[PDB]
């Protein structure tokens, strides 16, 4: 109806803007004939312990989009204070700080920022957040080991 068509035109518009000006290290788009269900790819950022890894995510837009945030999760395992073993992302933009002015492009930028700079003081996985805050050499070691075991 009205609402679903509105969501579709906006998802469509955001897809077009993204393919016309892709990020160098990322990508996102519908898996098949389903514009509400996307896959994304994030290259592990250089200058971080996810270096060299490839991380895949699923994105599900709601019928209320853009007035509700997309649902975004990792399908590649990753060692991170704000990402758990289910792939769930504790990130403000996806919860209380959503705005209909934001986009998937901005969601991807924010997740990359999150990988470069965890939020251990508001953890999703408290033990990883503790190792991050107390022993960054060990956090970096384990994060690189997970990158090699699961994303390379």
């Amino acid at each position: 109806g009205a609402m679903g068509s509105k969501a579709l035109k906006r998802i469509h518009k955001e897809l077009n803007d993204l393919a016309r000006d892709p990020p160098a290290q990322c990508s996102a788009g519908p898996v098949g004939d389903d514009m509400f269900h996307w896959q994304a790819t994030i290259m592990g950022p250089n200058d971080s312990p996810y270096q060299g890894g490839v991380f895949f995510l699923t994105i599900h837009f709601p019928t209320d989009y853009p007035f509700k945030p997309p649902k975004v999760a990792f399908t590649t395992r990753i060692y991170h204070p704000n990402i758990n073993s289910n792939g769930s992302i504790k990130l403000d933009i996806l919860r209380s700080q959503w705005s209909p002015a934001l986009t998937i492009s901005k969601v991807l930028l924010s997740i990359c920022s999150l990988l470069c700079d965890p939020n251990p003081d508001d953890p999703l996985v408290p033990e990883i957040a503790r190792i991050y805050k107390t022993d960054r050499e060990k956090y970096n070691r384990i994060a690189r080991e997970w990158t090699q075991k699961y994303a390379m």
Binding site: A7, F36, H60, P62
Partner: protein, 69 residues
């Protein structure tokens, strides 16, 4: 009253949603169904997608008056 209840949740609905078949579901349930069971209507089995879901605004007003009881 069975009609305040969802056709999946089997509970009173907070966000009533109607399909082209004319069946009303609570939003979360129908969307989870569409995304992770299949793109079809659970009661009529006809094809259904997320963008065809229509807010059942009349039914929401019904639940609101029943809540105030």
């Amino acid at each position: 009253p069975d009609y305040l209840c969802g056709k999946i949740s089997f509970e009173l609905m907070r966000e009533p949603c109607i399909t082209p078949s004319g069946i009303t579901y609570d939003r979360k349930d129908i969307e989870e169904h569409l995304q992770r069971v299949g793109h079809f209507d659970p009661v009529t089995r006809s094809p259904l997608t997320q963008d065809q879901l229509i807010p059942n605004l009349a039914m929401k007003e019904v639940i609101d008056a029943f809540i105030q009881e």
